Scaffold this active site. Structure first.
Site, PDB file in Angstrom:
ATOM      1  N   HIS A  40       0.872  -1.217   0.000  1.00 38.14           N
ATOM      2  CA  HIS A  40       0.000   0.000   0.000  1.00 38.14           C
ATOM      3  C   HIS A  40       0.892   1.244   0.000  1.00 38.14           C
ATOM      4  O   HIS A  40       0.405   2.351  -0.009  1.00 38.14           O
ATOM      5  CB  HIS A  40      -1.024  -0.012   1.255  1.00 38.14           C
ATOM      6  CG  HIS A  40      -0.427   0.302   2.650  1.00 38.14           C
ATOM      7  ND1 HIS A  40       0.058  -0.517   3.528  1.00 38.14           N
ATOM      8  CD2 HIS A  40      -0.275   1.526   3.234  1.00 38.14           C
ATOM      9  CE1 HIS A  40       0.479   0.104   4.564  1.00 38.14           C
ATOM     10  NE2 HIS A  40       0.285   1.376   4.410  1.00 38.14           N
ATOM     11  N   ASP A  84      -0.001  -7.632   2.017  1.00 39.07           N
ATOM     12  CA  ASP A  84       0.526  -6.262   1.966  1.00 39.07           C
ATOM     13  C   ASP A  84       2.042  -6.218   2.068  1.00 39.07           C
ATOM     14  O   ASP A  84       2.585  -5.784   3.069  1.00 39.07           O
ATOM     15  CB  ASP A  84      -0.068  -5.436   3.118  1.00 39.07           C
ATOM     16  CG  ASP A  84       0.216  -3.903   3.035  1.00 39.07           C
ATOM     17  OD1 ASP A  84       0.650  -3.445   1.999  1.00 39.07           O
ATOM     18  OD2 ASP A  84      -0.024  -3.234   4.031  1.00 39.07           O
ATOM     19  N   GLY A 175       2.625   6.460   8.030  1.00 39.54           N
ATOM     20  CA  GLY A 175       3.985   7.064   7.905  1.00 39.54           C
ATOM     21  C   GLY A 175       4.955   5.990   8.333  1.00 39.54           C
ATOM     22  O   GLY A 175       6.045   5.923   7.826  1.00 39.54           O
ATOM     23  N   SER A 177       4.237   2.988   8.047  1.00 36.11           N
ATOM     24  CA  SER A 177       3.775   2.096   6.918  1.00 36.11           C
ATOM     25  C   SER A 177       4.943   1.411   6.187  1.00 36.11           C
ATOM     26  O   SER A 177       5.846   2.127   5.823  1.00 36.11           O
ATOM     27  CB  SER A 177       3.030   2.949   5.905  1.00 36.11           C
ATOM     28  OG  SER A 177       2.300   3.903   6.683  1.00 36.11           O
ATOM     29  N   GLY A 178       4.898   0.116   6.002  1.00 37.46           N
ATOM     30  CA  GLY A 178       6.026  -0.575   5.277  1.00 37.46           C
ATOM     31  C   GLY A 178       7.200  -0.874   6.183  1.00 37.46           C
ATOM     32  O   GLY A 178       8.044  -1.698   5.875  1.00 37.46           O
TER      33      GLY A 178
HETATM   34  N1  LIG Z   1       0.289  10.668   2.620  1.00 37.92           N
HETATM   35  C1  LIG Z   1       1.106   9.657   2.685  1.00 37.92           C
HETATM   36  N2  LIG Z   1       2.318   9.733   2.213  1.00 37.92           N
HETATM   37  C2  LIG Z   1       0.693   8.469   3.266  1.00 37.92           C
HETATM   38  C3  LIG Z   1       1.595   7.355   3.350  1.00 37.92           C
HETATM   39  C4  LIG Z   1       1.238   6.139   3.915  1.00 37.92           C
HETATM   40  C5  LIG Z   1      -0.030   6.084   4.384  1.00 37.92           C
HETATM   41  N3  LIG Z   1      -0.598   5.088   4.930  1.00 37.92           N
HETATM   42  C6  LIG Z   1      -1.804   5.389   5.240  1.00 37.92           C
HETATM   43  C7  LIG Z   1      -2.757   4.317   5.916  1.00 37.92           C
HETATM   44  O1  LIG Z   1      -4.120   4.725   5.828  1.00 37.92           O
HETATM   45  O2  LIG Z   1      -2.658   3.211   5.031  1.00 37.92           O
HETATM   46  C8  LIG Z   1      -2.367   3.695   7.363  1.00 37.92           C
HETATM   47  N4  LIG Z   1      -1.280   3.077   7.622  1.00 37.92           N
HETATM   48  C9  LIG Z   1      -1.260   2.665   8.831  1.00 37.92           C
HETATM   49  C10 LIG Z   1      -0.287   1.962   9.513  1.00 37.92           C
HETATM   50  C11 LIG Z   1      -0.569   1.656  10.832  1.00 37.92           C
HETATM   51  C12 LIG Z   1      -1.790   2.050  11.458  1.00 37.92           C
HETATM   52  C13 LIG Z   1      -2.052   1.708  12.770  1.00 37.92           C
HETATM   53  N5  LIG Z   1      -1.303   0.801  13.336  1.00 37.92           N
HETATM   54  N6  LIG Z   1      -3.031   2.286  13.403  1.00 37.92           N
HETATM   55  C14 LIG Z   1      -2.746   2.769  10.702  1.00 37.92           C
HETATM   56  C15 LIG Z   1      -2.404   3.047   9.399  1.00 37.92           C
HETATM   57  N7  LIG Z   1      -3.072   3.670   8.488  1.00 37.92           N
HETATM   58  N8  LIG Z   1      -2.017   6.620   4.877  1.00 37.92           N
HETATM   59  C16 LIG Z   1      -0.921   7.073   4.337  1.00 37.92           C
HETATM   60  C17 LIG Z   1      -0.625   8.309   3.784  1.00 37.92           C
HETATM   61 MG   LIG Z   2       8.724   2.723   9.305  1.00 40.80          MG
HETATM   62 ZN   LIG Z   3       0.229   3.183   5.896  1.00 38.93          ZN
END
Ligand SMILES: NC(=[NH2+])c1ccc2nc(C(O)(O)c3nc4ccc(C(N)=[NH2+])cc4[nH]3)[nH]c2c1
Ligand SMILES: [Mg+2]
Ligand SMILES: [Zn+2]
Ligand SMILES: [Ca+2]
Ligand SMILES: [Zn+2]
Ligand SMILES: [Zn+2]
Length: 223
Positions: A40, A84, A175, A177-178
């Site tokens: 994602h 993912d 943020g 994320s990954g």
């Molecule tokens: N604007 C960006 N550059 C961006 C980058 C990655 C993103 N990823 C999300 C999400 O919406 O995919 C998102 N990633 C998550 C990871 C962990 C949790 C959590 N543990 N509560 C929730 C999350 N939501 N939006 C994002 C926006």
């Molecule tokens: Mg990280």
């Molecule tokens: Zn994310």
């Protein structure tokens, strides 16, 4: 990362920052030429930044390398976020040192109870927006699949696990994320999703990497 702490400069040497003109996701170095991150976090035009700590300041230990190819898992479902995981190949192999090191892939999956380290430059406010410039760490245990599934009925597959605190307060967040989830020396999860961040009874959900080792090894050897 919410309720975490400042890791310290280069204490998580396998952590990477994916940048497409600004940091947007994290990732893990698995060897000098490849990085694993979340599907994602897929984008075109990604530059990988290794040896980072403050991502807004060139402190001296960074290596900025462009990606030559990105492979999203063949069965990734963007609706459920099942599978993912994505692999990024670097245009040049990174130079590994004390500050840039690869992390090992697991031989078996980890048990609930096991404490892990999760890190990233993601949001740090559950209710709010505060993005840090230095890496933030968090230690959380893997939760049983039973409490994971109760928190998210019909949304969890065998390729995901939850880690965190049901009381809320500590969690990874957008943020992060990954990013990596390391337990006992092996990369066991990738920061994937959650319901908001650090909410009570809404733990973080991670990709279960032990189910992808043969795909990762076969994919990097043939690319
Ligand atoms: N604007 C960006 N550059 C961006 C980058 C990655 C993103 N990823 C999300 C999400 O919406 O995919 C998102 N990633 C998550 C990871 C962990 C949790 C959590 N543990 N509560 C929730 C999350 N939501 N939006 C994002 C926006
Ligand atoms: Mg990280
Ligand atoms: Zn994310
Ligand atoms: Ca920097
Ligand atoms: Zn989002
Ligand atoms: Zn989100």
């Amino acid at each position: 990362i919410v309720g975490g702490y400042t890791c310290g400069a280069n204490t998580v040497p396998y952590q990477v920052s994916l940048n497409s003109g600004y940091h947007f996701c994290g990732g893990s170095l698995i060897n000098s030429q490849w990085v694993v991150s979340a599907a994602h976090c897929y984008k075109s035009g990604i530059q990988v930044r290794l040896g980072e700590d403050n991502i807004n300041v060139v402190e001296g230990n960074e290596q900025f390398i462009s990606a030559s190819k990105s492979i999203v898992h063949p069965s990734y479902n963007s609706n459920t976020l099942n599978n993912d995981i994505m692999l990024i190949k670097l245009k040049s192999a990174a130079s590994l040192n004390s500050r840039v090191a690869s992390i090992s892939l697991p031989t078996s999956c980890a048990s609930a109870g096991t404490q892990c380290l999760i890190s990233g430059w993601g949001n740090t406010k559950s209710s709010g927006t505060s993005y840090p410039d230095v890496l933030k760490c968090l230690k959380a245990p893997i939760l049983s699949d039973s409490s994971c599934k109760s928190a998210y009925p019909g949304q969890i597959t065998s390729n995901m696990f939850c880690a965190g605190y049901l009381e809320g307060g500590k969690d990874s967040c957008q943020g992060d994320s990954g990013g990596p989830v390391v337990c006992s020396g092996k990369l066991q999860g990738i920061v994937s999703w959650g319901s908001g961040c650090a909410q009570k009874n809404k733990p973080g959900v991670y990709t279960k990497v032990c189910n992808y080792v043969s795909w990762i090894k076969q994919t990097i050897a043939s690319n």
